[PDB]
Scaffold this active site. Structure first.
Site, short mmCIF file in Angstrom:
data_model
loop_
_atom_site.label_atom_id
_atom_site.label_comp_id
_atom_site.label_asym_id
_atom_site.label_seq_id
_atom_site.Cartn_x
_atom_site.Cartn_y
_atom_site.Cartn_z
N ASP A 112 0.87 -1.28 -0.16
CA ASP A 112 -0.13 0.04 0.12
C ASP A 112 0.98 1.14 -0.01
O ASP A 112 0.53 2.25 -0.69
CB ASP A 112 -0.96 0.00 1.22
CG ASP A 112 -2.31 -0.67 0.96
OD1 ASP A 112 -2.36 -1.30 0.23
OD2 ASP A 112 -3.12 -0.38 1.90
N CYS B 236 -2.30 0.71 -13.48
CA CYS B 236 -2.44 0.88 -12.05
C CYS B 236 -3.78 1.66 -11.54
O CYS B 236 -4.68 1.46 -12.44
CB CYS B 236 -1.08 0.93 -11.29
SG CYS B 236 -0.15 2.44 -12.28
N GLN C 179 6.58 7.72 -10.55
CA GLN C 179 5.93 8.87 -9.74
C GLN C 179 6.97 9.46 -8.41
O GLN C 179 6.47 10.67 -7.97
CB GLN C 179 4.68 8.32 -9.06
CG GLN C 179 3.39 8.61 -9.97
CD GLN C 179 2.28 7.85 -9.52
OE1 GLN C 179 2.18 6.72 -9.08
NE2 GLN C 179 1.32 8.73 -9.42
N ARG D 39 3.39 2.48 -10.83
CA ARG D 39 3.80 1.27 -11.12
C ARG D 39 3.82 0.75 -12.57
O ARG D 39 4.69 0.07 -13.05
CB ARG D 39 2.83 0.25 -10.49
CG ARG D 39 2.73 0.40 -8.93
CD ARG D 39 1.81 -0.21 -8.21
NE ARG D 39 1.33 0.43 -6.87
CZ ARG D 39 0.51 -0.08 -6.05
NH1 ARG D 39 -0.22 -0.81 -6.49
NH2 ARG D 39 0.39 0.70 -4.76
N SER D 40 2.96 1.31 -13.48
CA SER D 40 2.87 0.98 -14.42
C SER D 40 4.14 1.37 -15.50
O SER D 40 4.71 0.81 -16.50
CB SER D 40 1.72 1.49 -15.43
OG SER D 40 0.36 1.32 -15.14
#
Ligand SMILES: CCC(=O)Nc1nc(C)cs1
Ligand SMILES: CCC(=O)Nc1nc(C)cs1
Ligand SMILES: CCC(=O)Nc1nc(C)cs1
Length: 282
Positions: free
Chosen positions: A181, A215, A262, A221-222
């Site tokens: 998370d 994502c 990010q 994440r992508s």
């Protein structure tokens, strides 16, 4: 510089935030006018994440062709990817329309439907064989065929039917279920194992349309997934693998979609994954 020793040099000097901010400063800025039209407000999950006009995927529809999705075309590596946000309640039909029209074999999902107590994307695939889904706005039917649950990821076989033509196709759903998370994984081993499973399926290969990867926003994440894949492929193709420059590859990918990677922690994790992955390949 090479990668593994540039890596230790940034760790020892504690300068990951400065490296990452340089990338942000140098990244391309292209218009995203279609994304910002008022009629498309409920087609975007986040107001600050939009596809560029020049690389956006168009739906084959004359009313409204817009979806928050981008084509990342990597010329030297000879790989393409579609990066998209997690589908919204009012875009699940558009999502499967895109999969159909672009001739994709695989969908890569890097998030859970609920994280941090909030919904990160719609439940856009069926959970039971006998309870199929019909998307009336785009005239598609989707059926769960089989499901294989492993410790870090799940693979599903799905059948997508175009109800207008009665044509059917098999789609593979690759679901990475264990990204934490908060933060990034401590080791890249399970993420790399997952990447190799996607590769082994054919879903990334030129005989199919581009893989669809998402994502929640489709940039973090992508971005890590396609950056690691492309860097490892280039290291196999070139005479000198130490010439692969992960920062340059990332800036090339950011010509096609904003914001890829990010956080500075995601940047460091991408380096780690490519470094460990290059040892296993040989
Ligand atoms: C049906 C209206 C529409 O946009 N059709 C399209 N066909 C292609 C191939 C692109 S757009
Ligand atoms: C259970 C669905 C599944 O794993 N399908 C796969 N097909 C290939 C070819 C690899 S994994
Ligand atoms: C800002 C990200 C970052 O510094 N991550 C680091 N992890 C270790 C273990 C050293 S630096």
């Amino acid at each position: 510089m090479e990668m593994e020793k540039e890596f230790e040099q940034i760790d020892k000097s504690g300068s990951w935030a400065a490296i990452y901010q340089d990338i942000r400063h140098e990244a391309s800025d292209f218009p995203s006018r279609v994304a910002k039209l008022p009629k498309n407000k409920n087609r975007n999950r986040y107001r600050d994440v939009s596809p560029f006009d020049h690389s956006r995927i168009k739906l084959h529809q004359e009313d409204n062709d817009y979806i928050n999705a981008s084509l990342i075309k990597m010329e030297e590596a000879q790989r393409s990817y579609i990066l998209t946000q997690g589908p919204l309640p009012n875009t699940v039909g558009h999502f499967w329309e895109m999969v159909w029209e672009q001739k994709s074999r695989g969908v890569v999902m890097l998030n859970r439907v609920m994280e941090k107590g909030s919904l990160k994307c719609a439940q856009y695939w069926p959970q039971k064989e006998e309870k199929e889904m019909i998307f009336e706005d785009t005239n598609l039917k989707l059926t769960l065929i089989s499901e294989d649950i492993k410790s870090y990821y799940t693979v599903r076989q799905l059948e997508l039917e175009n109800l207008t033509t009665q044509e059917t196709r098999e789609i593979l759903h690759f679901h990475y279920t264990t990204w934490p998370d908060f933060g990034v994984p401590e080791s890249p081993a399970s993420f790399l194992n997952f990447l190799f499973k996607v590769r082994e399926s054919g879903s990334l290969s030129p005989e199919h349309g581009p893989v669809v990867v998402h994502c929640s926003a489709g940039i973090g994440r992508s971005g890590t997934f396609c950056l690691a894949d492309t860097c490892l492929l280039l290291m196999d193709k070139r005479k000198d693998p130490s010439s692969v420059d992960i920062k340059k590859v990332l800036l090339e990918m950011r010509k096609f979609r904003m914001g890829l990677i990010q956080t500075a922690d995601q940047l460091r994790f991408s380096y780690l994954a490519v470094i460990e992955g290059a040892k296993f390949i040989m």
